[PDB]
């Protein structure tokens, strides 16, 4: 109860930033998430006991695969920790508590694998759940993580207030299916051009909540150039195993999942800064100006890869 989590000072000071990388001490990230708790949230959100064993919980359920593993998880909670911090008024108690649960939880027992890959092998996940196949999947991981024995972490909350947060959850989890994005951001640029983004109206917040996911789950890109460039290794070491496995079903994978056109990630990042990674930072920093640091350090990585194409790395 007068157990506060405290890191050592360079974190404590650089953590509180949007670049913050979470380092290569594994065992350091709980005390980091559970630090990102009590300082968005307050030291009562959880009972620490339950706290600690849920986020144990959710670690052995994530596998090791090169990019959509436990530091992804720990990543995107970070981002989430920022955001929440840099617009403190804006969320209420329930949504400060739910979305750094979310976050920790968006990718749960990732095999490494597209929705797409799923469909093509016909996995049983893809007859269980015929869209956001892998997110479906994720909150039903969450959920029965919660149900196992002294991992409530939500039991001081009444049974609405409970039912709620796990409707955020879902909502949450749901949004950071990359294909629900583009509709998702193009809605809250109009509303948000129109004038009509209104807050209070519940349908609003959701996708509101819905960018912040994709901001935070694509936060890789909005990282110091060392750290943007080595993330790129990972995210394309799952895509081309996917497109080695495309192949043994017989199938020409896209381009991006095809270890045979490597020369062309620099375009492929372009492509990708371009039609995702920017639009989404730019909506963000209109919606919540605080956020900006992220729009500019995803221009500035942009930078880095025109960079890259030119010879000048
Ligand atoms: C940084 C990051 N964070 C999150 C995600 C989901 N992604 N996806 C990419 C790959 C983007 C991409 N790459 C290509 N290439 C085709 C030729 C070689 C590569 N295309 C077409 N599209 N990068 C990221
Ligand atoms: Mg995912
Ligand atoms: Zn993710």
Same mark, same amino acid.
């Given at each position: 109860?007068?157990?506060?989590?405290?890191?050592?000072?360079?974190?404590?000071?650089?953590?509180? !930033?949007?670049?913050?990388?979470?380092?290569?001490?594994?065992?350091?990230?709980?005390?980091?998430?559970?630090?990102?708790?009590?300082?968005?949230?307050? /030291?009562?959100? &959880?009972?620490?006991?339950?706290?600690?064993?849920?986020?144990?919980?959710?670690?052995? %359920?994530?596998?090791?695969?090169?990019?959509?593993?436990?530091?992804?998880?720990?990543?995107?909670?970070?981002? @989430?920790?920022?955001?929440? #911090?840099?617009?403190?008024?804006?969320? /209420?108690?329930?949504?400060?508590? *739910?979305?750094?649960?979310?976050?920790?939880?968006?990718?749960?027992?990732?095999?490494?694998?597209?929705?797409?890959?799923?469909?093509?092998?016909?996995?049983?996940?893809?007859?269980?759940?015929?869209?956001?196949?892998?997110?479906?999947?994720? &909150?039903?991981?969450?959920?029965?993580?919660?149900?196992?024995?002294?991992? %409530?972490?939500?039991?001081?909350?009444?049974?609405?207030?409970?039912?709620?947060?796990?409707?955020?959850?879902?909502?949450?989890?749901?949004?950071?299916?990359?294909?629900?994005?583009? *509709? %998702?951001?193009?809605?809250?640029?109009?509303?948000? =051009?129109? *004038?009509?983004?209104?807050?209070?109206?519940?349908?609003?917040?959701?996708?509101?909540? *819905?960018?912040?996911?994709?901001?935070?789950?694509?936060?890789?890109?909005?990282?110091?150039?060392?750290?943007?460039?080595? /993330?790129?290794?990972?995210?394309?070491?799952?895509?081309?195993?996917?497109?080695?496995? @495309?192949?043994?079903?017989?199938? =020409?994978?896209?381009?991006?999942?095809?270890?045979?056109?490597?020369?062309?990630?620099?375009?492929? #990042?372009?492509?990708?800064?371009?039609?995702?990674?920017?639009?989404?930072?730019?909506?963000?920093?209109?919606? !919540?100006?605080?956020?900006?640091?992220?729009?500019?350090?995803?221009?500035? %990585?942009?930078?880095?890869?025109?960079?890259?194409?030119?010879?000048?790395?």
């Amino acid at each position: 109860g007068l157990m506060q989590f405290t890191l050592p000072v360079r974190l404590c000071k650089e953590i509180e !930033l949007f670049h913050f990388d979470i380092g290569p001490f594994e065992n350091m990230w709980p005390g980091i998430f559970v630090y990102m708790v009590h300082r968005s949230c307050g /030291t009562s959100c &959880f009972e620490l006991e339950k706290l600690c064993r849920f986020i144990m919980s959710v670690k052995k %359920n994530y596998r090791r695969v090169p990019y959509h593993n436990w530091k992804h998880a720990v990543t995107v909670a970070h981002c @989430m920790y920022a955001i929440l #911090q840099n617009n403190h008024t804006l969320f /209420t108690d329930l949504e400060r508590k *739910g979305l750094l649960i979310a976050c920790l939880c968006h990718d749960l027992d990732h095999r490494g694998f597209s929705n797409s890959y799923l469909q093509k092998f016909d996995h049983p996940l893809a007859a269980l759940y015929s869209t956001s196949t892998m997110e479906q999947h994720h &909150f039903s991981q969450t959920v029965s993580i919660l149900q196992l024995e002294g991992h %409530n972490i939500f039991s001081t909350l009444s049974s609405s207030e409970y039912e709620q947060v796990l409707e955020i959850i879902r909502k949450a989890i749901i949004a950071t299916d990359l294909a629900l994005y583009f *509709g %998702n951001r193009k809605q809250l640029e109009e509303m948000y =051009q129109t *004038g009509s983004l209104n807050l209070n109206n519940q349908s609003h917040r959701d996708r509101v909540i *819905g960018l912040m996911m994709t901001a935070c789950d694509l936060c890789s890109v909005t990282k110091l150039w060392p750290v943007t460039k080595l /993330t790129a290794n990972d995210i394309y070491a799952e895509f081309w195993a996917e497109g080695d496995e @495309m192949k043994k079903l017989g199938i =020409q994978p896209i381009p991006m999942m095809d270890r045979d056109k490597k020369d062309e990630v620099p375009q492929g #990042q372009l492509g990708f800064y371009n039609a995702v990674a920017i639009p989404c930072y730019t909506t963000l920093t209109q919606i !919540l100006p605080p956020t900006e640091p992220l729009l500019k350090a995803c221009r500035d %990585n942009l930078s880095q890869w025109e960079k890259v194409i030119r010879g000048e790395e």
